[PDB]
């Protein structure tokens, strides 16, 4: 308790000595409260005018237009301690899983150079504003690194002074760049060296790309077994127990020297003990603390969520297969059975799963898995939108399974070759491309973000009639040499000024390990669409009068945007489509 968090609390107390009151009407039950102090401040979603002017039919579709307008009583709940049997299953599984992930990888510190290079090409590191303006400036200043140095030596000494969370079914925990650096130095290797690649972790999909996920789910479907299960957890980050954080910390057992000590400090001082500052309109700042739940950087959060989800799903698989009888207590002979199961079939069972942080697909040995709920519920990983003891409903067809906000279609090219393509409701895709985040966007920067969405659509969603047409229109409306941009950056192959037909050939043919015939495609007309009825099912406006008028008059929309941007060099991409080709 206060021996580990006091120093952080003490330091904040003194910087607001004018305002420090132990408020009596504090709304916290599950968070430890410590005091308040005076502040006054808040970043709404802005519309992308280039994308909206080229998607006129969607101006009267509420599912699109409502997306641009506008639970923290789930962060303030508690999770019960798992039973002894459950704690044993988790410890055995976690020990085995770090060893498997460690067989072909070496833990190592990430460098100031790697961190500096990240900041100097806009990765969402979740930092705050203040002594330097931006991340780019602090990183190019020796003073910062001396603050970093002071904290670093405090961590080597087993103590913390400045590693404090700022809070803002979501919740992002920003830290100061320094605390983020020290987290990246100790634990960045999990992402930087691809510990959760499919090659390394067998269940993972880190670095795979949306053009691979469908083929991965089809490969899982080919295993003998029961239905495909895709159960969502209700508020995964809030269900991470102190036992989970201790099993995650066992990655330090594989480390040595300075690295081991720096990593043990991140786990002990920032993950297993947290200090957080939260805005309350009653506007004050509350300084609250707790031991459990997930609150790390978003990239470390991804890897540790993937780890703990892989662990939880192996245990649910063990329950279904009858490897243990009860979570109350593991007998000596059940422990050896669980160890033996892991050694003999553990790697096969990992290959039955696709796991992306809190998101999973499992094809178990049989459907006993559906009603194997005791360990899953006792670990606190309670399923969303189903009663606690109601058996899971599985999917009979891999093309219906939800994963990473998508489903996947099997699409046969006129030449017989097979594409497995990503898909989601088209209102969601159009609504997202019509939104920007943040202030000070020039017309050029707005155009270049629209171009990033257009090129993503050409590469991932070419099979949706409306998106191939809208992508061609946006790429015709934005100057040909202007470079696509994002502000918060899976593999992003559409972020390029290379010709999109050349990129399509590289991604779907040349580098596609599921495509045996490497014959390049010569034009966009060789590249197929979904069935017309399937395209409508997934939200196409094909068949509507609004959509017909838009398609017919598209050159008028393109010319409106070109007139706003001004006298620049543009390319007409519309004749790449049969209907504009004379």
Ligand X SMILES: CNC(=O)c1cnc(C)s1
341 binds, among Zn ion, ligand X, none (CB under 5 to 8 A by kind): ligand X
The answer to whether the annotation marks 259 as part of a ligand binding site is: no
> Minimum distance from CB of 363 to ligand X (Å)?
17
Helical segments of 277-378, H only = 298-320, 332-350, 374-378
DSSP string, 106-119: ------HHHHHHHH
Q: In whole angstroms, how large is the CA radius of gyration of the chain? A: 26
The answer to whether the annotation marks 407 as part of a ligand binding site is: yes
Contacts (CB under 5 A) with Zn ion, residues 120-159: 151
Cα–Cα separations (whole angstroms), residue 90 to 104, 272, 295, 317? 23, 17, 21, 13
Which residues are CB-contacts of 228 (< 8 A; sequence separation ≥ 6)? 217, 220, 221, 361, 362, 363, 394, 395, 396, 398, 401
Distance CA 434, CA 58 (A): 10
404 binds, among ligand X, Zn ion, none (CB under 5 to 8 A by kind): none
Helical segments of 351-425, H only = 374-378
Q: Please name the helix (run of DSSP H) or strand (run of DSSP E) that holds residue 432, with its range, or none.
A: helix 426-433
Q: Return the number of the residue (331 or 340) whose C-beta is nearest ligand X.
A: 340
> Minimum distance from CB of 335 to ligand X (Å)?
11
The answer to whether the annotation marks 160 as part of a ligand binding site is: yes
Q: Which residues of 18-41 are buried (b: 16+ CB within 10 A; e: fewer)?
A: eebeeeeebeeeebeebbbbeeee
Residue nearest to ligand X (CB): 340
Q: Return the number of the residue (74 or 325) whose C-beta is nearest ligand X.
A: 325
The answer to whether the annotation marks 198 as part of a ligand binding site is: no
> Minimum distance from CB of 216 to ligand X (Å)?
25
Distance CA 452, CA 495 (A): 6
The answer to whether the annotation marks 431 as part of a ligand binding site is: no
Three-state SS for 170-238 is CCCEECCHHHHHHHHHHHCHHHHCCCCCHHHHCCECCCCCHHHHHHHHHHHHCCCCCCEECCCECCHHH
Does residue 423 interact with Zn ion by CB under 5 A?
yes
> Minimum distance from CB of 341 to ligand X (Å)?
4
Give the closest residue to 484 by CA, choosing from 464, 510, 507, 503: 503
345 binds, among Zn ion, ligand X, none (CB under 5 to 8 A by kind): ligand X
Distance CA 45, CA 435 (A): 6
Q: Return the number of the residue (323 or 372) whose C-beta is nearest ligand X.
A: 323
The answer to whether the annotation marks 23 as part of a ligand binding site is: no
Q: Return the number of the residue (160 or 372) whose C-beta is nearest Zn ion.
A: 160
Q: Return the number of the residue (96 or 195) whose C-beta is nearest ligand X.
A: 96
Contacts (CB under 5 A) with Zn ion, residues 152-191: 160, 163
The answer to whether the annotation marks 404 as part of a ligand binding site is: no
Q: Return the number of the residue (4 or 299) whose C-beta is nearest Zn ion.
A: 4
> Minimum distance from CB of 316 to ligand X (Å)?
15
Angle between the N-to-C axes of helices 465-477 and 426-433, in degrees from 0 to 180, rounded to the nearest 10: 20
CB 392 within 8 A of CB 383: yes
Contacts (CB under 5 A) with Zn ion, residues 492-551: 538
Q: What are phi and psi of 167, to 5 degrees?
A: -85, 150
Q: Return the number of the residue (160 or 330) whose C-beta is nearest Zn ion.
A: 160
CB 354 within 8 A of CB 213: yes
Summarize as ranges the residues that interact with ligand X (CB under 6 A).
Answer: 323, 337, 340-341, 344-345
The answer to whether the annotation marks 316 as part of a ligand binding site is: no
How many other CB atoms are found less than 10 A from the CB of residue 368? 15
Distance CA 496, CA 355 (A): 29
> Minimum distance from CB of 204 to Zn ion (Å)?
25
> Minimum distance from CB of 280 to ligand X (Å)?
53
Judged by CB under 5 A, how many residues of this single chain contact Zn ion? Answer: 5
CB-based burial label for 480 (10 Å; 0-12, 13-18, 19+): middle
The answer to whether the annotation marks 384 as part of a ligand binding site is: yes
509 binds, among ligand X, Zn ion, none (CB under 5 to 8 A by kind): none
Q: Which stretch binds Zn ion (CB under 5 A): 79-87, 115-123, 165-173, 417-425?
A: 417-425
Q: Return the number of the residue (340 or 489) whose C-beta is nearest ligand X.
A: 340
The answer to whether the annotation marks 525 as part of a ligand binding site is: no
Q: Return the number of the residue (160 or 262) whose C-beta is nearest Zn ion.
A: 160
> Minimum distance from CB of 162 to Zn ion (Å)?
6
538 binds, among Zn ion, ligand X, none (CB under 5 to 8 A by kind): Zn ion
The answer to whether the annotation marks 232 as part of a ligand binding site is: yes
Residue appearing with tokens 């150079």: 113
Distance CA 507, CA 297 (A): 30
CB 173 within 8 A of CB 295: yes
Q: Return the number of the residue (141 or 410) whose C-beta is nearest Zn ion.
A: 410
The answer to whether the annotation marks 141 as part of a ligand binding site is: no
The answer to whether the annotation marks 499 as part of a ligand binding site is: no
Give the closest residue to 221 by CA, choosing from 368, 373, 420, 464: 420
> Minimum distance from CB of 319 to ligand X (Å)?
13
Which parts are annotated binding residues? 151, 155, 160, 163, 170, 232-233, 235-237, 305, 358-359, 384, 407, 409, 423, 538
Which parts are annotated binding residues for Zn(2+)? 151, 155, 160, 163, 407, 409, 423, 538
Which parts are annotated binding residues for Mg(2+)? 232-233, 358-359
Which parts are annotated binding residues for CTP? 170, 235-237, 305, 384
What are the residues binding Zn ion (CB under 5 A)? 151, 160, 163, 423, 538
């Amino acid at each position: 308790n206060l021996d580990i968090i006091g120093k952080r609390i003490e330091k904040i107390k003194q910087e607001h000595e004018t305002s420090w009151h132990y408020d009596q009407d504090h709304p916290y039950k599950t968070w430890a409260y410590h005091g308040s102090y005076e502040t006054k401040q808040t970043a709404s979603s802005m519309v992308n005018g280039v994308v909206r002017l080229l998607t006129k039919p969607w101006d009267i579709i509420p599912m699109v237009t409502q997306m641009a307008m506008t639970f923290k009583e789930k962060v303030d709940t508690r999770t019960q301690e798992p039973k002894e049997g459950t704690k044993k299953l988790m410890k055995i599984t976690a020990e085995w899983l770090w060893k498997e992930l460690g067989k072909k990888k070496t833990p190592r510190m990430c460098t100031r150079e790697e961190f500096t290079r990240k900041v100097r090409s806009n990765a969402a590191l979740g930092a705050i504003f203040n002594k330097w303006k931006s991340a780019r400036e602090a990183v190019e200043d020796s003073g910062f690194w001396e603050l970093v140095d002071k904290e670093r030596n405090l961590h080597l000494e087993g103590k913390c002074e400045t590693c404090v969370y700022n809070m803002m079914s979501r919740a992002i925990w920003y830290m100061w760049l320094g605390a983020r650096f020290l987290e990246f130095e100790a634990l960045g290797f999990l992402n930087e060296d691809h510990w959760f690649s499919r090659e390394n972790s067998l269940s993972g999909v880190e670095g795979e790309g949306l053009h691979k996920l469908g083929y991965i789910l089809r490969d899982v479907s080919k295993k003998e077994g029961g239905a495909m299960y895709a159960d969502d957890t209700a508020g995964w980050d809030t269900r991470i127990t102190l036992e989970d954080l201790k099993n995650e910390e066992m990655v330090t057992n594989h480390m040595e020297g300075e690295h081991k000590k720096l990593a043990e400090a991140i786990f002990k001082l920032t993950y297993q003990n947290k200090v957080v500052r939260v805005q309350r309109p009653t506007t004050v700042m509350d300084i609250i603390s707790r031991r459990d739940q997930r609150g790390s950087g978003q990239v470390v959060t991804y890897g540790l969520n993937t780890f703990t989800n892989m662990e939880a799903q192996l245990i649910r698989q063990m329950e279904g297969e009858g490897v243990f009888k009860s979570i109350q207590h593991l007998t000596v002979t059940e422990e050896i059975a669980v160890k033996n199961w892991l050694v003999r079939v553990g790697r096969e069972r990992l290959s039955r799963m696709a796991i992306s942080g809190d998101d999973c697909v499992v094809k178990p040995l049989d459907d006993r898995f559906a009603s194997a709920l005791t360990a899953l519920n006792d670990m606190g990983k309670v399923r969303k939108d189903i009663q606690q003891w109601e058996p899971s409903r599985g999917w009979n067809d891999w093309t219906q399974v939800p994963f990473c906000s998508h489903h996947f279609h099997e699409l046969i090219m006129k030449d017989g070759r097979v594409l497995v393509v990503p898909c989601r409701n088209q209102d969601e895709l159009i609504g997202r491309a019509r939104i920007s985040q943040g202030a000070g966007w020039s017309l050029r920067e707005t155009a270049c973000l629209g171009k990033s969405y257009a090129q993503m659509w050409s590469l991932m969603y070419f099979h949706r009639r409306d998106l191939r047409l809208a992508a061609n229109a946006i790429c015709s409306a934005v100057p040909s040499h202007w470079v696509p941009t994002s502000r918060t950056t899976a593999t992003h192959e559409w972020m390029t000024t290379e010709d999109m037909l050349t990129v399509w050939n590289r991604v779907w043919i040349q580098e596609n390990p599921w495509m045996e015939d490497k014959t390049p495609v010569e034009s966009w007309e060789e590249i197929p669409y979904l069935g017309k009825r399937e395209d409508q099912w997934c939200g196409s406006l094909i068949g509507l009068t609004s959509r017909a008028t838009w398609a017919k008059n598209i050159q008028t929309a393109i010319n409106q945007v070109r007139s706003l941007i001004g006298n620049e060099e543009y390319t007409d991409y519309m004749p790449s489509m049969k209907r504009f080709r004379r």
